[PDB]
From a paper:
The biosynthesis of betalains involves the enzymatic action of 4,5-DOPA-dioxygenase, which catalyzes the key ring-opening reaction of DOPA to produce betalamic acid, a crucial intermediate in the pathway. DOPA-4,5-dioxygenase (DOD) is an enzyme that catalyzes extradiol aromatic ring cleavage.
Crystals were successfully obtained by screening and optimizing the conditions for purified BvDOD and diffracted to 3.08 Å. The crystal structure of BvDOD, which included 263 amino acid residues (Asn6–Thr268) and one Fe atom, was ultimately refined to an Rwork of 16.70% and an Rfree of 22.00%. The crystal structure of BvDOD conformed to the P3121 space group and accommodated two molecules per asymmetric unit. Superimposition of the Cα coordinates from the two molecules revealed a root-mean-square deviation of 0.186 Å, which highlighted the high degree of structural consistency between the two forms. The enzyme displayed a single-domain structure with a mixed eight-strand β-sheet surrounded by 10 α-helices. A crucial feature of BvDOD was the presence of an interior pocket containing a mix of hydrophobic and hydrophilic regions accessible from the exterior. This pocket, approximately 20 Å deep and 585 Å3 in volume, was strategically positioned to facilitate substrate binding and catalysis. These residues were strategically located within loops that connected β1-α1, β2-β3, and α9-α10, respectively, playing a crucial role in maintaining the active site’s structural integrity.
Residue numbers in the entry: 6 to 268
Amino acid sequence: NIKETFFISHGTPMMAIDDSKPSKKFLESWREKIFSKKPKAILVISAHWETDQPSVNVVDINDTIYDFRGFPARLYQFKYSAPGSPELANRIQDLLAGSGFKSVNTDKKRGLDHGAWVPLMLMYPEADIPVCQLSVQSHLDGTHHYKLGQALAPLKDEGVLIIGSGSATHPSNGTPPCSDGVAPWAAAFDSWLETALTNGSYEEVNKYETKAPNWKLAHPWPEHFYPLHVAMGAAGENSKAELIHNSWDGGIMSYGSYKFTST
Ligand SMILES: [Fe+3]
């Protein structure tokens, strides 16, 4: 049914209201210009939900979680009450367990963190498509998440839109900006990633720690990068990666987003 998986950049919560971000106009054009098909359900691997073992969201309605401090009060008024899919949740449990993940937990009470509901509120604003969330295991490695994606790969034939939500670059809150360029280290890293992805060098991206330039500056902590790996795996071995968006915030926080097309 569905032959694509995506990695997008959840940005920061300001992307719900800051229209000075091309990221927002990009996400808003989702159903018209990016993915026209209506998916049966949506699975989001969001970087803002990390756990020790794979964890799935099992609720019939997602609560809208404001996992951010220090923003306009308008942001805490938002509700993206999309349904959950216990169907999909179980399907994910079984698919993951069937591939070697013996311990895979479930949370029957939590909804969507801003890593899911902020983008989804722009792409699918009616809030009527089931959204189920998968967690990222930050203290593991990239290959683990590639495998989590491979395990999820069959979900596509069942109308599931697999989306990893992170940031192409996620420099520390302590990294200094660039006044009117794009920081050299960040362009190096983004260039590396594109060259890897568009050529299907997925083993390389699994091994970013030993092949990417400036990865410690780009991803000091991996959580915002591992959803890329998951979408990568879910697309498949010979999928075709395309860069569908890029924009920068401080000259250092890339918003790059990729579409993986299985063949
Ligand atoms: Fe974030």
